[PDB]
Symmetry: D2
Subunit: 331 residues, 4 copies
């Protein structure tokens, strides 16, 4: 008897690896619900003889029993080979398995696609699938994902205790994002200023206020003073990735300010149906609404962000999926 719930969780990354922190946050929610961590360290697999890799995995999995539910946050970023072998280890236990997709590698870019057959093959060894969007599920099914049981994540949480402050109507735009991933910054043409929070040492266009990498808590603290959240991606290419959930979008709303997002985003409806800000087409549509928007137009939009965001702040999108995933994994 006595079933337990385990969740994989990666470790050993740069303190700025967003993938790692996103897994770490989910795992944090998991523990409070009583679930148990399956630690996974990120290392180079080829340093391992198959037998060594095997028994490393036996070490990761030691605690497991015919019994349990395992939540697999994919990918481990130890390359596909690791995910593949991780799963077979899992599948030789008498367990139900939830795969929690954070990224889909063969869809990260064209010509990485070939990995799809392998990927889908191990995706289909799971009993329940949690995907960020309904869109993601539907293309994943277009490549042979057979799994009957599916959950939509909808939106990244952002558990925190930051102080929200009184929010001014500042006609600024926040963007905590590495500039060498998003070209649109280096192209900043507009009279409204782009606050850019980045560790990387360099200089930026004339009305782009470069700001050194703040610790998250402080970042949430500062942004809560006003302005807007920019959710842009990924510059030109890497855009059909209208699939996954942005982590900064959640990071914005938790601060308590409205957001701006480009049309077609994953789980767009959430933003409309909950008031959180504007969905626009071009970068230029934005400048217009930031420049030409009413002060109490802004007043409202905040009041709602802060109405909506205790979900994000106490982590309820995550609680939701970590609970139904399991439930649907039995029933």
């Amino acid at each position: 008897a006595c079933m337990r719930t385990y969740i994989t969780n990666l470790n050993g990354h740069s303190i700025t690896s967003t993938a790692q922190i996103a897994q770490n946050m989910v795992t944090d929610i998991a523990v409070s619900l009583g679930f148990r961590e399956l630690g996974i360290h990120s290392y180079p697999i080829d340093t391992d003889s198959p037998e060594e890799m095997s028994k490393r995995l036996d070490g990761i999995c030691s605690g497991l029993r015919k019994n349990d539910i395992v939540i697999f946050q994919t990918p481990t970023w130890n390359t596909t080979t690791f995910d593949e072998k991780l799963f077979h280890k899992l599948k030789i236990f008498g367990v139900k398995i939830v795969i929690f997709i954070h990224d889909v590698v063969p869809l990260m870019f064209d010509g990485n696609f070939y990995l799809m057959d392998r990927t889908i093959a191990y995706y289909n060894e799971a009993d329940v699938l949690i995907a960020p969007s309904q869109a993601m599920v539907d293309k994943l099914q277009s490549y042979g994902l057979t799994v009957k049981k599916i959950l939509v994540q909808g939106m990244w949480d952002h558990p925190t205790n930051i102080t929200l402050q009184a929010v001014n109507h500042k006609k600024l735009v926040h963007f905590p994002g590495n500039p060498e991933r998003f070209n649109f910054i280096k192209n900043w043409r507009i009279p409204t200023e782009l606050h850019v929070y980045t560790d990387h040492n360099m200089q930026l266009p004339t009305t782009v206020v470069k700001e050194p990498y703040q610790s998250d808590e402080q970042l949430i603290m500062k942004m809560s003073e006003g302005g807007y959240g920019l959710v842009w991606m990924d510059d030109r290419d890497k855009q059909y990735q209208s699939l996954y959930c942005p982590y900064k979008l959640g990071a914005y709303i938790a601060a308590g300010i409205p957001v701006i997002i480009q049309k077609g985003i994953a789980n767009q409806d959430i933003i409309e149906k909950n008031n959180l800000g504007f969905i626009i087409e071009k970068i230029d549509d934005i400048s217009n609404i930031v420049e030409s928007t009413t002060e109490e137009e802004y007043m409202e939009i905040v009041s709602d962000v802060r109405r909506f965001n205790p979900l994000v702040r106490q982590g309820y999108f995550t609680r939701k999926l970590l609970t139904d995933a399991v439930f649907s994994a039995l029933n």
Copy 2:
């Protein structure tokens, strides 16, 4: 401005009160999820002046802050006047309210079907409701329940660490209800033994072999050695039949024995799609199937009930609604 979640919880009913312990169980789940208790004692409120009363409530709610969330488990059994008075207090606080329906008082027994409209009245003020089933919601909106966000319970959990003994093919039928609430018991006609667990003494058709009320643990221990669980009503209430979730349906499945229940029950889809037992017309239909089933087809059903029940034994039907309810309360 920091959200916490409270849930209302009964205290002071008898050892043998299902209403209280179904609520206590929910509460114990809520605690493990981090939620906080608004304790509520059951008493005649005729002994309160509608102001001493207000202050008692004020002391029930003194932990509450502004955009916390309250889960109200209804009913309180302190009478409708309390229910709505408890409730009205919550509306003062600028919070979001979850109404968890254990029972709708004015449907159960057509004495006091009249209280309905004051019930609905204080129902229509919550922000989301969690109800036994969709058919239960549907009948409620027919009475004017204007609440948009709904959410279906589906099944009672029965969280426990009780030992499951190997199930063998006792051609027994188990039944831990109360003979003069479920009076189809005094009408036993069939050559299949009916075991009945209850407070009331001295009432026996003949093959109804009755036993004294046992602590929940033991019941589930001994029921696990084999046989079938039965979930049935009088014709008295075959409408409320099709609405509620039964506690002993959950109390059977956690014992890891198959159940037999009446076609038209709320959420029979769960019994079917998870093959947890037989869905059947009349009680004769049952006895036939209890007689005609062979050893191996019973092995499948037990294995299926036992594939299924850690869900019920670890609190997940509850955990489910305790988490989505709070979620849909903020979302739109």
Copy 3:
């Protein structure tokens, strides 16, 4: 018969109230330990007939059952009759009472003394007592505390997930208390500057700089840029100082900077043996040390304050007493 643990937790006070904060905060640990809140609202008491109020007490306490455990965080700041009568309610239950002393209102400021004998009366009605320091238990004994089982708090935790930024050597002293309760502040003379975090802006010595009351979170960040935490009281309150636990003490150490405290203060050996700042005898011994301190010496001292402070940031002083209190309340 299943033991649940309860803790009291006052509410409704000003978001600036340290009393409420040091209670909500402990309660918050207790919740995560699975304990349950007994919410309490702070209000002026005699808008209540002795019978009305008794029924609001009945509402705060409805969730209790015999053989539970209740932790009374005292005082409630609802005056001493409330402490007395609350406690009286707890004693008609078959329970064990942990009395957790956050303050002793009689030994606090003079004139409050007269309530001493009544306070000891209801102190002596609990099973285990939790006091800030052994020295405080000793004084309570001299005034008639007859409760056998004592347990020392030691220090306030300061749970937080705030950023500690790189600290060292700002040659400045930090002080987040109201100036009106410590007026050593106004007689500030010495050339090193005093940051003061407070509600007011009344008065202003030259080398004293003030800041508007920042939310706890942001404060600990800033303080974590270096400088010293000064734990001081105005010397009418030294009788008390040698007994209580200072919350700002923890707030400093939580930010990750070394402290300055006065000799004789409660649980000083804590500071000594974990090397978290200086113990000095006057204000002037202090400034002397704030100047004349090597960058290397400050280095290590910070290093020590941060070897140490996950204790207070994860709640372990609170977790410690909350566990042992309930234990000794049963063991003998």
Copy 4:
């Protein structure tokens, strides 16, 4: 710098392995407190090469981080080799390490003593040690355990929800010990019955009554009905057993019945100061005391056993040590 607590958890033993059952239960408690499991599987270490093992260990510790804290339930039963190396692994991380002793190999009997120096070697790499009895710590320090912070366990908890049946005065002695280890059983000559609960098929002396192994919950329910619980040694396995905490002792008390224990065993002061049973010289002293005891005396003895066992049923002896151990690991 976010401190997390980890605890090692042995797995993959037979369901009758008390070692595993004890480590599992501590861990379940730990998990409730927010601590984190380091799972470990039991297996022949010889199937691994240095490289293989190093990496198996790597995978066990993947989640580990600097500034975390790890609690090592020792021994793993993967042999000393494995224990030494697991510890070497842990010391590589900049963490604080609590060592929870369940057994000490080089003391299990003579000739195993050569293992002492290697055992002590790695024991001394700990910051805090938790032993069952103060007696245990004293003996360890006579061999070179230089770890300055020690904490005492005292007694096994037994988290359970068994129904405590009404307890009659059954002049019989329960004993769920496996005979092959406890040979005093075979020597049973006494007119008082001896319930021996054992999975082994091997017939037993006359007024010994053999029960097949039963689930722990059923056992506890059975014994709750009444009678006495015996905690007895063997004779050679005795000195070493004066240092341990018996697990079945806690089984009794949680069951709700008094106990009978041989003079000198670890932590007997808990039995005496809490009324838990009799402490006696030989086997006969027992039968005497069992025969020559009145009914009201037994009501007494039970009522205080049931006074006391919420500690064990809710896991507080463990909660104590899991909280204070960790606290003491940061706190010089």
